[PDB]
Design a protein around this ligand. Structure first.
Ligand SMILES: [Br-]
Ligand SMILES: [Br-]
Ligand SMILES: [Br-]
Ligand SMILES: [Br-]
Ligand SMILES: [Br-]
Ligand SMILES: [Br-]
Ligand SMILES: [Br-]
Ligand SMILES: [Br-]
Ligand SMILES: [Br-]
Ligand SMILES: [Br-]
Ligand SMILES: [Br-]
Ligand SMILES: [Br-]
Lengths: 135, 133
């Protein structure tokens, strides 16, 4: 597993959905797709493949179908984001604050560029966007 | 959510770069009942397999086809020692790990300790299972 620092932090935070999200996209999708996954959090706020997705939560719209998800309580407190992995019918779900999501994404893209130095320039550009966007 | 109980397991699995083991236990503890987790602990030394949505293990039968394990981290253990397969996520695209059964017992011994420490009502059942490891 190349996600050494991501896994350590996410597992220690009981956010195993994040661990699964990155590993399964990395192993199955192309590296170009993974780069888009890293980027979309700053732009559209959503990304989805078979068995893995995230979506920033629009708190001006209905949140009733998040009530049973781990992390539901974050929505009322701060801008939050929904992650899921696995089957569409029985997904493994997690909600976390967007700030924490950016923390994870910055760690994950670091793991990736460290393991795949050919992607140094592109990953640093995306990290720059994280720093611009996220206080 | 349910707070993480796998304090000692997580230290060891992370140290060993066996993240799937911690994901496996965190998944079962979060999504399933404590009685189900107990059966997870028990089955490794009885039937040799256990599965829920998002987490499973199966002892590897090295007398049967192992071609589908070829790309899994830990595949090389199969020819060296009795081994066991773990996966987390969904079978469309699961996150997979193979380790020797002796190491799996080592992890389960730590995990079941975390469990009984957090949930002392299960003291006796856990101690009995631990003896088998
Ligand atoms: Br940590
Ligand atoms: Br999680
Ligand atoms: Br690729
Ligand atoms: Br998308
Ligand atoms: Br970095
Ligand atoms: Br640690
Ligand atoms: Br792993
Ligand atoms: Br329970
Ligand atoms: Br073959
Ligand atoms: Br291997
Ligand atoms: Br082998
Ligand atoms: Br103990």
């Amino acid at each position: 597993n190349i996600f050494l620092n991501l896994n350590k932090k996410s597992i220690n935070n009981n956010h195993f959905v994040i661990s699964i999200f990155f590993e399964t996209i990395y192993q199955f999708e192309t590296k170009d797709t993974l780069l888009e996954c890293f980027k979309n959090i700053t732009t559209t706020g959503h990304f989805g493949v078979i068995g893995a997705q995230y979506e920033k939560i629009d708190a001006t719209r209905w949140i009733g179908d998040y009530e049973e998800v781990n992390g539901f309580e974050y929505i009322d407190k701060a801008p939050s984001i929904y992650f899921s992995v696995g089957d569409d019918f029985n997904p493994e779900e997690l909600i976390i604050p967007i700030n924490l999501a950016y923390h994870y994404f910055n760690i994950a893209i670091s793991d990736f560029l460290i393991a795949h130095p050919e992607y140094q320039k592109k990953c640093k550009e995306i990290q720059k966007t994280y720093s611009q966007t996220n206080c």
